[PDB]
Ligand SMILES: O=C/C=C/c1ccccc1
């Protein structure tokens with residue numbers, strides 16, 4: 001599913017991300033924009049052989065099982081395919097664990113590089129939510 005901007009914002013808020021661990025909704029929308037262009041089906045292979053899945057490009061190195069990342073962990077206790085669903089629940093719940101693990105949203109390098117420090121409220125401006 002490719003979400004619209006405001007549509008994703010709404011969904012994220014319904015699933016409990018608005019201000020989760022102190023990160024406003026525009027932070028989460030901005031991260032999703034640059035990780036996946038709001039596409040739940042996004043995947044990208046990392047040169048080491050792990051893969052990133054879904055709207056928030058969650059990495060099989062640590063967070064999900066895809067059967068093809070030697071030595072990895074599955075801390076969210078889910079198949080990586082769950083992160084590709086049109087329903088964002090699995091991605092949101094796993095993101096809550098990631099953002100809680102000590103480094104906040106810096107876990108998403110693209111958030112650090114393209115969202116952190118910017119006017120992230122622009123991502124939710126005007127939305128009905
Ligand atoms: O963009 C880099 C890699 C993309 C990709 C996506 C799914 C599996 C393998 C590779």
Ligand SMILES: O=C/C=C\c1ccccc1
Pocket residue numbers: 121122123124125
């Ligand atoms: O507030 C702006 C609406 C959409 C959009 C465009 C670019 C950046 C943020 C959001």
Ligand SMILES: [Cl-]
Pocket residue numbers: 024025026027120121122124
């Ligand atoms: Cl915001």
Ligand SMILES: [Cl-]
Pocket residue numbers: 065066067068069070071072
């Ligand atoms: Cl594996």
Ligand SMILES: [Cl-]
Pocket residue numbers: 021022103104105
């Ligand atoms: Cl933090």
Ligand code: NA
Pocket residue numbers: 060061062063064065066069072073074
């Ligand atoms: Na894994």
